[PDB]
Amino acid sequence: AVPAPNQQPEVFCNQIFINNEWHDAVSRKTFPTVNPSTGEVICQVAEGDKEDVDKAVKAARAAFQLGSPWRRMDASHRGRLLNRLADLIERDRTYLAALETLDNGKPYVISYLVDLDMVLKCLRYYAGWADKYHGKTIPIDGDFFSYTRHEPVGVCGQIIPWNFPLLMQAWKLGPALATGNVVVMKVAEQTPLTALYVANLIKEAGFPPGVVNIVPGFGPTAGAAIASHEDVDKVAFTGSTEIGRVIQVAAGSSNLKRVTLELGGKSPNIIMSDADMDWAVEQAHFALFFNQGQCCCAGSRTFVQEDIYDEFVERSVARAKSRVVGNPFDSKTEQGPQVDETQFKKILGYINTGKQEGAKLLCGGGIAADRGYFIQPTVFGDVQDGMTIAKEEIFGPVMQILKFKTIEEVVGRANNSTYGLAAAVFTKDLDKANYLSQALQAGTVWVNCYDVFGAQSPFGGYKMSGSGRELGEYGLQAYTEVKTVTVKVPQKNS
Amino acid sequence: AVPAPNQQPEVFCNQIFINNEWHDAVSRKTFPTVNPSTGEVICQVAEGDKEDVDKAVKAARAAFQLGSPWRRMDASHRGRLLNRLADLIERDRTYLAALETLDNGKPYVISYLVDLDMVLKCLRYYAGWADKYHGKTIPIDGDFFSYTRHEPVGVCGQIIPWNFPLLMQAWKLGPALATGNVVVMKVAEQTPLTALYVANLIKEAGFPPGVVNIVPGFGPTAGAAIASHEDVDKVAFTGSTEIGRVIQVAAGSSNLKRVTLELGGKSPNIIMSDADMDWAVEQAHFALFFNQGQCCCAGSRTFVQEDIYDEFVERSVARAKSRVVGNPFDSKTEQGPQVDETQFKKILGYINTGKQEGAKLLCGGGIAADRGYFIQPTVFGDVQDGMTIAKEEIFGPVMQILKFKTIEEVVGRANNSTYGLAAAVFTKDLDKANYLSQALQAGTVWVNCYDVFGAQSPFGGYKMSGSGRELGEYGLQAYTEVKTVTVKVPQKNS
Amino acid sequence: QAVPAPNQQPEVFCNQIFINNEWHDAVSRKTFPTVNPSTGEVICQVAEGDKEDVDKAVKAARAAFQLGSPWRRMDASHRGRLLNRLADLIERDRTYLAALETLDNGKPYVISYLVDLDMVLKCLRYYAGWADKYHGKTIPIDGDFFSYTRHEPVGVCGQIIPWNFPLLMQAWKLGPALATGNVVVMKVAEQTPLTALYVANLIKEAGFPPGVVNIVPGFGPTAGAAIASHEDVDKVAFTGSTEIGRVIQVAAGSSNLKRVTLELGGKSPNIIMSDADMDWAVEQAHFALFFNQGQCCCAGSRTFVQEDIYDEFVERSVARAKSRVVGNPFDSKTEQGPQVDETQFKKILGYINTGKQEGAKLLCGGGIAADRGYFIQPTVFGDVQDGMTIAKEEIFGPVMQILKFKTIEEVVGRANNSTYGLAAAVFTKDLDKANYLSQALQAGTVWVNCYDVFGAQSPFGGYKMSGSGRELGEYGLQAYTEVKTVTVKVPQKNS
Amino acid sequence: AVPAPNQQPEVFCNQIFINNEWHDAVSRKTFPTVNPSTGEVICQVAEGDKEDVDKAVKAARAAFQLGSPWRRMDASHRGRLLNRLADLIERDRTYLAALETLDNGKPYVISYLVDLDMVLKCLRYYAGWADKYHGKTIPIDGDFFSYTRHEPVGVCGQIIPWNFPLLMQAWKLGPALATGNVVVMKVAEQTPLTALYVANLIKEAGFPPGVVNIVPGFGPTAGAAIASHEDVDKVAFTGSTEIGRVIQVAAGSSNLKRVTLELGGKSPNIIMSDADMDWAVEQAHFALFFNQGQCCCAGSRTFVQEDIYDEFVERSVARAKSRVVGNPFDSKTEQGPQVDETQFKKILGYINTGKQEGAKLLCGGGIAADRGYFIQPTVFGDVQDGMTIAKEEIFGPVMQILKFKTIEEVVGRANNSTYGLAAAVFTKDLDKANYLSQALQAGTVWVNCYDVFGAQSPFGGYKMSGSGRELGEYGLQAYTEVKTVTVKVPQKNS
């Protein structure tokens, strides 16, 4: 039971957040953020650039100074603050969910039940890690006492995308704050609003000034300034593989700041002939169409064994044809519009390429509404590995169904990609499941399920889908700088 | 008790090692490797370039294929192989120590008692880790069974320096092989001999073909080919900060391969007025002059509290003057020549800058011999923070002694650097020791000691001294790719 | 810092047996009185649980632990949510619980409020974070197999606690147990059952499924022994005397081989080196001994002082002991309340006479401090020798022992020459002396330049006969986990 | 292929091992050890009692004193010593395998290929743990620095059984010595020889005097003296559930020494209808009959689904009838004699009980030879849960086959036992495998296999099958005493 939404939530925050205060861009410039459902401007937002990032980094560095309130704060207390932040977010859950839908386009029911829930679970999970990421006492040779201190990496630049505005912010802040780091976050220009409101909650929660600084703005400007900053110790980025390369280059070209990347993919969803048909069809649908197809780990390569190909395709088409597209604020809406005009056009371009290359168009393929950025649920059959839609990340409601014969064959085809974010296996057989999960070159391998995320379980990509992991205990690794202290002792004993 | 060395050890390996076989460079080109003590050529060595690296990567990739001998091998057996390799290196200890000295220049007594001992301890330590780096079973929400597999990152490109040829090879091979990875190693052009002989021992130990491949050659050629290779999954580099930046940029500009760096420093060695004078003086001497001053973590900024400054300096100068420079094969030799002419000239250049800038030359200052790359143990007193010799890594037998008054002052001065590899504190006071070890922004802080390395304790730098850590359990992190497997289960129970 | 005014006569709302989130009278309908140690008067009667009541509690716990039950299926993260909720409810009723603790126990209200309750909240909140983080392992075993371990709950946990820290001991037990999905049958101390029973009401209010936590107030040889000997209790955690510790382990072995962890007493040495900060060491040595009316398991009951500073250290310690305010625990000026009961009161008086009889120099106190209640004067014995009974046995009262020593090698030997090894401390400014001593001392916790510094993050437990196993920190989860290895045959094992 | 065995290996050690020396019992008494294949006395062995244990404990205590050679020894060197012992054991493998067979009765081929191999793997695995079991640095509240030291528990009393003499000794010594503890081992009166010979190797390997002391003798005498000793810090026992209780009572009655127990069981081996018939039959045979049925985790309750019951039974009887029983030194022998006359008669008694209670005798059931303790491979069909042979541990070549219908039924019947050491599931279905592995109350659950031991994976029982775990990292826990050191610092920072 979801509370009735305010289909027109008021915007209270639209500036640059530094030292728990709101500031206009030094240039005084602003940029519009659009409601993808109507194509209308919601409001103006401060356009942060290099100079604003500089102010943000200085504030973060000051908050990270030895002896500061944030540095002296008990680890357990950082946990207390993260829990308080989660409580505040829960209080304002109905509002944030509506605002998320307004600025992003995803169905309100999904914003409320899925996104906001995961945000709360991520923040509360990491709050528990605050005073538990122990260093080590080491039995080194000789008369010495050796141990390690798990110190904060320092000033962390965090650049996030627009597909899960609130969630991406939580996946970043959770681990960083739990370990005592300070943040300079650059939210996506397409979805800056919700993250900015949470900044107000961060101040209300009690976090010292400068611990979390948010700079809304464009990528080549604000984003690059963070990645190239001489005083940013670490950068965490989630987005396109293309910009991931730019980030890494900027890091190497500047102060050698530590880097972790969460990029895209072309994840293979493998359906074996012994899989539960009804379950696999529904899960394959969800795997691809979830969040308007705007998911990094989307099951965009649906491999189906020949014996069950026809039936699976028929059922998948029927499911795609009945998928409700419309106003994200209407409870019956399963799919809202795409984030912006650029994505809208790019997706339509991919559908055209799909038709041109010989992929069999089974349903959809065009615009779903005359207003907004709505696209019809599209399904392509008889897709070949060499096809563009079978290789490139579409990031829209466009499903690819491929046919295979043997298990050995599908492993090779699934792995024949520059991406490796995720994969899935649908089978009732124990050996097939273990054979495939071990063989698949992907960060996450789901068996008889898809898009199952847990704050306890790490997520990240193999190959060019990224480096490093987020969520779980692993999510703390990149936010820790290790110091070894080796002390001479009179006489070491076991 | 050190066995009498063969002052002219025969060279058996001087080619490119691929698939457990010796090959000439595709171009058939060779480069000379010089004996720094005499300036004479030892022998010619195959000059590996891009085409040779390509062959090496393909061999490594083949050896890493699923179902291959190396992939199927029990983790405990990889441990058995590492132990076997250690035994073979111990069998040929006297020979390797002599060859190390011949090619590098360091005293034979040191090569035998220190370098070789550390190589053996490193390999035997990692041998034990082979079957103990567990993944995790995670209590994720919902009806799921979630766990992680700690798989090998893959084809690892390993680029190492010339200061500790065998030890650097060990620090790289140990963690990589322990975790089931395959290697393409680029040894330093100044010291390729000892590493090539070890390749023979790797074959003798029983490691499958392609598991370890070694390509001797230059940096911009062979090294850059590895860093930019589209099929290399991870690169580990040890060397200058300048080239470290080049490596990270190459990785980002290519296939987003994972990166870890071990660069230089300008490590501060702080002597508080309550320190044991005799011990502090001897340790500070060792901290700087060890291995001809060619140590990444050399104590190149000796901070001495004003009350004991004069006495400390007087004793330091006396010790530097008594240091025996000469033939590394002579038991009485404490300091051999610098690695090559380039380093020789660079050091003399820094000494000149020290004189030009007003630092007080207290002893040494020039060449120590008319043949070979020998430099006199040099000590500069009254060094100021703004001086070139106080900021840049000299990598030679040139000591800088600075004066300070308060503990608060020295912390700021010690940390005022783009480097942060190591640091040391000499004091008898508990509080001062804890205050300093916590406040110093350095990868390793030594208290009442220096250059105390243990295979069990991690080593790495803060800031621009590098990223990631080697040695200890931490050394396994960069050689692991994490995979999450999440399986739907009938009903999850605790 | 600031403390809300206490209700010096807090109303008692819970005084029965807690099973399946409901209150029950003992099957026998028997009740026992709990006394206010400050006045010696009866506060109220409490249901007297016995074997038959324990059996019911164990059966309820077993049912709550059945596969498919709400508590077994509950997401680990949610168990953490429930623990945080319980902590919030305890904080809401902090002032009430602080006063009730003082009424039943006797400790100063200011301490119950600022110390005990604070530590309770911190313990529960720490463990809530552990709920979904105590991972099992995936193991690189030889051959074509996939091997891993599940960290399952040990099962029905019997927890028997003492009276010196009623609420805190309850929290130290519940936190790790609930965080790991176990169920509990807790036997609170007969001298202080009230606060734990009220917390049961908060456990129900928090949302814990019925049977997850069951509390049986009653005596030791009856209710406590029934838990230790129970054929369906999988694990027992006990805190109290070394003697009952042995009885518990024997009962475990003679019954179903239930797993056992013990937190017993000690005769903890507090070593003061000649280079220590005098003022700091004196104040800390006083605290180390006299805290909680000297009723602390890890009390620094053997104060070793280096000869060169002995005279001055003693003079300052005596003056500090003489200035210690003894009186009504509800009065803000009060530093020391009464001992927990008449039995302890008499036992301490006996040890004081024992000290005088064996030759220890009585420096101050040594008698009854008040006509009513169980108040004892802060007592200090000087020139104590290792062979004295007051130097060997746990007094558990406001009785300090000061011993003199010369060298660091000597003090290590004397401090370790004991059947106890719960804790120890070292006061020195020297790096080497601190490292030499912390390594050499055979104790569970070694404090350097401090004492009684507990952290929910750091393990606590004894060496030798001071106990086995550890509580608090990550280590506190070990005893509440039963490890299962699952080894599956796979087509072809690859790294 | 296995080397030719010396069918009558010379006995070199038969006394009490204390301080790396051989002693007779204080009472000068000895006891005979018998060859179970002929019933003939091999030799006399010193009968250790309380006074001998007292001498061993004092020696162990002395070796454990602070500052002793064993206490000061580098953790890494303890690993070196364990690896050396393994090497000596491997050098004398042919001899030890033959001696094991002579004293125990198990087939020489198995002693050589299985027992000795596992002994080597156990010691080599733990050798690797010596310097890797780290303590922690903890982020405690307030201005303190808190850390934990993982110290050795101290003097460890280790009492082991006769079913796997050498292996049981290795499972105890490996973890204990890896963590720096000292040992007073009490070997089984039925099989003291091999352990005593290894004591010689322990001395030859270089372990300091008193680190390992071995006292051969009886249970109520030497064993009980160890369990009740006032100066033994920890006791690890493997044997019967009955004596396990006696050990725990002794510990509680004495000095509260820490306790871990590895007892027996009545492990259920579950065969679902979709299991691989051939594989399940051979594995079920192995599961029960392995080691003359003298295995703690023997699959003595073979549950078979009704649909495949008749066929499974027919194949199981045929396999049991073909099992070769005879001279353990003959390469064709699969089953040697039982350990002694006591066990021999106990098993026959159980077989008679099985017949009286209504179980269907399908094959065997009697003595297999007129000399030695040989018993025919016996199989009972239509066994019911209430039958004595279905509840009590037989420890002989007596198989129980029960029929079941549903999965919920088999899980409940399998769990309806006071034991819970191990269990197994044979099925091709993923969900069935996961459901059973989770629901079964057993220390180890094998899936599509049985008796798969790995030094890397823990082993131990649920309920009355024991407490604590051996093998893996978990095996180190009981050998560690944890010490927390909390230090006041001037100002704590993250």
Ligand SMILES: NC(=O)c1ccc[n+]([C@@H]2O[C@H](COP(=O)([O-])OP(=O)(O)OC[C@H]3O[C@@H](n4cnc5c(N)ncnc54)[C@H](O)[C@@H]3O)[C@@H](O)[C@H]2O)c1
């Ligand atoms: N951190 C260290 O341990 C360390 C080691 C050696 C040198 N140094 C520093 O570096 C200074 C210069 O010495 P150097 O030139 O021999 O160090 P370097 O960084 O140039 O060489 C290190 C390794 O990287 C390879 N390399 C060089 N250029 C490369 C490139 N363009 N792409 C890929 N790999 C490349 C080299 O061949 C060698 O194998 C030294 O004086 C000292 O200050 C530091």
Ligand SMILES: [Mg+2]
């Ligand atoms: Mg872009």
Ligand SMILES: [Mg+2]
């Ligand atoms: Mg260079």
Ligand SMILES: [Mg+2]
């Ligand atoms: Mg009592």
Ligand SMILES: [Mg+2]
């Ligand atoms: Mg017996």
Ligand code: NA
């Ligand atoms: Na928008």
Ligand code: NA
């Ligand atoms: Na050279």
Ligand code: NA
């Ligand atoms: Na009371």
Ligand code: NA
């Ligand atoms: Na025998």
